[PDB]
Fold homoserine dehydrogenase.
Amino acid sequence: STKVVNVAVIGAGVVGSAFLDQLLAMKSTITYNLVLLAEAERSLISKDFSPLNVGSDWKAALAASTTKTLPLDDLIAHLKTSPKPVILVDNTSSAYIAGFYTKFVENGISIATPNKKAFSSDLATWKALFSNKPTNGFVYHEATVGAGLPIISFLREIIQTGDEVEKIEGIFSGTLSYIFNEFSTSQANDVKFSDVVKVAKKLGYTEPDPRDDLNGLDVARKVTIVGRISGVEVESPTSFPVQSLIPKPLESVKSADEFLEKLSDYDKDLTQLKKEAATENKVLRFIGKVDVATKSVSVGIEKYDYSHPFASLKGSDNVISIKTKRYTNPVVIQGAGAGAAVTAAGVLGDVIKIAQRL
Amino acid sequence: STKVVNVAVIGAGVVGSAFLDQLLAMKSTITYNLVLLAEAERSLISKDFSPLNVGSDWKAALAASTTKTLPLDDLIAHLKTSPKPVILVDNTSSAYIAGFYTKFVENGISIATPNKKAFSSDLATWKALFSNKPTNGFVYHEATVGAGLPIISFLREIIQTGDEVEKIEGIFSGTLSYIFNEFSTSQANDVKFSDVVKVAKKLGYTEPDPRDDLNGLDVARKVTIVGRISGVEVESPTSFPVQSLIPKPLESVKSADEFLEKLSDYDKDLTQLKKEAATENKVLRFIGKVDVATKSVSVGIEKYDYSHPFASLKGSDNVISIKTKRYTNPVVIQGAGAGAAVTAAGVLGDVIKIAQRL
Ligand code: NA
Ligand code: NA
């Protein structure tokens, strides 16, 4: 195509690898020259912004590189000299990098990313990333919430058309969704919370240290983002009630292994609350809630009648219910909210969106 | 890209009126100028291609206009003299208008529309639109399937990134959705088909003459569209199995009164199919289905488990299930699938997605 955009990638992790794969295989009218690939200290950099001749097994080419990664300030300066609109893809979860988004944006560099950090920081940095200055680059982050699901794009669309979001309620975590779906079920089950958590770990459905999936911290970030888009100036992921499923007695312990090894000793506590559902035929489930009218945001265990939808989800599917002035009966979008492929496509979906816009 | 886009609108009915109000009250960076508006024989057109001097007051002005409505050919020609990129928004359901999309597109005039005719008719008309001529305008038709629900945009993107659709199940009719949600539940009542349809009509959930809903034609057109987007070369909305709910005799009923009162005369069949389903813990749902591997599309009644997301819909929400190579667990998107404002928002969303390009 006559249209050309240069893509600067960072992150060759699980998501990132899937991304690159999907990008390099996408045949499109528009032309996407991969001008940079960085993973930790190594990098493949095309000084003159022509497309890197990587192709198949970029992982290897990257691995064979003698090029050291540029410090972000230097990266920005470099990217500034680009002859064509630049899109920076950040497939990490780095705070450092996120800490640079405003520098990127104000310098004409657009960003596409699944990295929730920059969007779950202080409101000031948020307002800055979306000021739409003439000289600013575009900022898309669909993968930030629900992964590939059209959560952010839909919210932004209906708000532009004149709609007013009233309430959001959803399960925004694949790990926590998998867990409760197995633990708390319509049938009076008997599975020990710690058991499904051990399954979640081994099936790869969980972060190295499951405490990182259990502190709710991640769900709070996502809800901060949806809350801010819905019109609620959430100050941060800690400025509202968030319930950590971590047993106080183990907040101490150093080894993730020790934690998981002792997690069972507290099953009788969580099983209690699942047993106290009986208050109506109800099931428990970790959710993120946002009430616009009263600026109320929160994340923690919630209970629904065996008959409610949340009581019958799929594997790690994590749904979200959007109630707006126009949508009296909420919009419910559900599906996989984790996984390299699904997540990466959400990121590529955003890259196409930016490129068509440049 | 352009900061000014001239909009030409045809049709100010239920969705159009709401479309026009929303467009004209839209807060936006870009400037959207309404240069031409046409309803029946009346039309408003500014030869300057400058904003129509009506403010938000377009309906009154239009109702008073003495200016005749331009022959499509002349409208194509006229829009070809717009100082700024043009977006045509066809809020009709005219097959006539549809027959001209090719020409509009072929002349760099973009289209945003709720009209299904052009995408649910001939198959070449379909391949025509979606050719990669390098000059032709863009074509967006979100409101043709799940009203404002991000159904079409989601498919296109997922496909672009490399995912492959495998199976699609969906309830694409508000009327039929409401009816079956009321008729068939897990409660297994004695509610008669006739009754619900009568109440649906009573509460204004159907067309004046309910045969227009029960015929399942609007659903086949919608399924044809997602079938083709998915990769199934569907010839027409009548080239595959489509189950009508109008009793074999009342299709020649004459009065639209006869039909409604004489309906009850065939409740027995549905009420038994409903009894057979309950016994199996299934619920009856009217749906449109697409199995890509076997290239088989269909419309009719299918049984669903009480635990299936379809057996718990609310009011008249539409719902779509999309199973893909990547999503081994179908993505499910539900919400209102009709309504003036909601459908307008969808059309405007496309208008916005178009203007951002250009
Ligand atoms: Na998302
Ligand atoms: Na739609």
User: Anything to note?
Assistant: Residues B 142-143, 145-149, 151-152, 346 surround sodium ion (ligand 2) (CB under 6 Å). The longest strand of chain A covers residues 282-291. Chain A has two domains: 1-160+336-358, 161-335. Chain A touches chain B through 48 residues (CB under 8 Å).
